[PDB]
């Protein structure tokens, strides 16, 4: 379980039964022939399991139990999970608001949430556990303080995240703090303030040994190393994730965080350029496809691994204007509709990702 260097080396990312179930029971029954066979393969690509609700915690243990059994059979698997239940979650948007609110004892609930997770990780110390810490949180504090919900959630976000990284700082764990993406914090003007924030989180948590680095492009679609700038990236020299991590990495070192590495989500980056009409359009973007398969052989000094954090097929937000959590971004002309609630299965989107996959599944 313990490691030195890249935590993705020496182990094999586990493909969870939750996503496998969604594909096999919600997607495959609608497909046939070659498509049905390609879809089955997708369910075997390792992706991160999101602990988006406390009700998901028993699932985390079930997954780890499955992994323990598999490793008993010669398996050498590692678990992959996303810590994502901050109070007043997704402060700059409306589609992914969570079950906890700062106003109603949210910080206390979050700590309880973290305690539940730590106890499971402690019980499964024998399993290498790779974690992404709170996607879509700190990034908002850099550019969205103009939004009341974010402005008022600052201290809670920092307090909760510090509790998460300090409590989950165990020898069998590798944590990557979410760091937005190239089109968000990658812009030269947002680089330094972002690096300072992340570095202050790291130092404020007493430089946790388990905090290996940052996670980028989570739930987004930027290419990892595309060579030609898409039209929508006009103005930003940092137009892919490689350029982004190589730009911010040195800045992290300047602010007290040295030896920080990265992992980048490529689960929906296979088709470039995407169908985005505006770079800031993040909801159920059309013209995307499954991308680079998870692997530690990145050939890049800063990237520990390509990963699939956001599970392709699970929606980014509802396109129903009358539904709760409706975010106008999900009704844009470059967003695939009709779309279900965030997290819910979106068959048409799964098919789009499968059809436009690169590497191909067909
Ligand atoms: C200037 O750059 C732009 O900045 C804006 C911010 O002002 C960026 O917008 C933000 O983009 C984020 C993605 O890049 C999304 S995150 C969003 O919510 C969550 C992830 O945080 C996802 O939903 C969850 O998915 C889980 C797994 O499927 C489920 O378990 C869970 O139930 C779901 O809630 C969702 O897929 C993501 O889309 C921000 O909402 C958005 O404001 C913009 O990206 C920059 O370009
Ligand atoms: C440091 O940790 C404390 C713990 O209470 C937290 O309140 C504070 O917001 C953290 N500061 C930063 C910059 O993360
Ligand atoms: C981008 O990365 C992938 C995976 O390592 C690699 O196969 C491809 O050749 C790279 N493309 C460029 C232009 O470097
Ligand atoms: C935990 O223990 C293993 C086995 O000795 C090491 O390989 C690892 O570096 C860590 O010390
Ligand atoms: C994890 O499991 C994979 C099997 O796909 C191996 O190839 C790898 O070496 C590790 O044992
Ligand atoms: C397997 O699990 C998925 C995700 O919960 C379900 O959608 C499916 O119906 C089955 O129970
Ligand atoms: C869901 O189950 C099917 C078989 O029923 C698999 O082919 C798929 O990969 C996923 O595990
Ligand atoms: C998807 O979920 C169904 C139950 O709804 C199973 O029967 C199937 O085997 C797969 O796990
Ligand atoms: C899979 O997708 C088909 C449409 O192609 C539906 O009819 C089915 O209910 C499932 O969603
Ligand atoms: C998808 O393709 C496989 C062979 O590659 C078949 O065995 C399966 O029945 C489906 O047609």
Swiss-Prot record:
Domain notes: The enzyme consists of two functional domains, a catalytic core joined to a carbohydrate-binding domain (CBM) by a serine-, threonine-, and proline-rich, highly glycosylated linker sequence.
Source taxon at top rank: Eukaryota
Location of region: Catalytic: 1-362
Post-translational modification: Asn-225 contains mainly a high-mannose-type glycan (Hex(7-9)GlcNAc(2)) in a 3:1 ration with a single GlcNAc. Asn-204 was primarily unglycosylated with a small fraction (18%) bearing a single GlcNAc at this site.
Name this polypeptide is given: Exoglucanase 2
Organism: Hypocrea jecorina
pH and activity: Optimum pH is 4-6.
Record site: Transition state stabilizer that also modulates the pKa of Asp-245 and may act as a proton acceptor through a water chain: 90
Keyword Hydrolase recorded: yes
Enzyme class: hydrolase
Enzymatic reactions: Hydrolysis of (1->4)-beta-D-glucosidic linkages in cellulose and cellotetraose, releasing cellobiose from the non-reducing ends of the chains
Note: T.reesei produces two different exocellobiohydrolases. They are unique in that they can hydrolyze crystalline cellulose in the absence of endoglucanases.
E.C. numbers: 3.2.1.91
Active site, renumbered: 136 (proton donor)
Protein keywords: Carbohydrate metabolism, Cellulose degradation, Disulfide bond, Glycoprotein, Glycosidase, Hydrolase, Polysaccharide degradation, Pyrrolidone carboxylic acid, Secreted, Signal
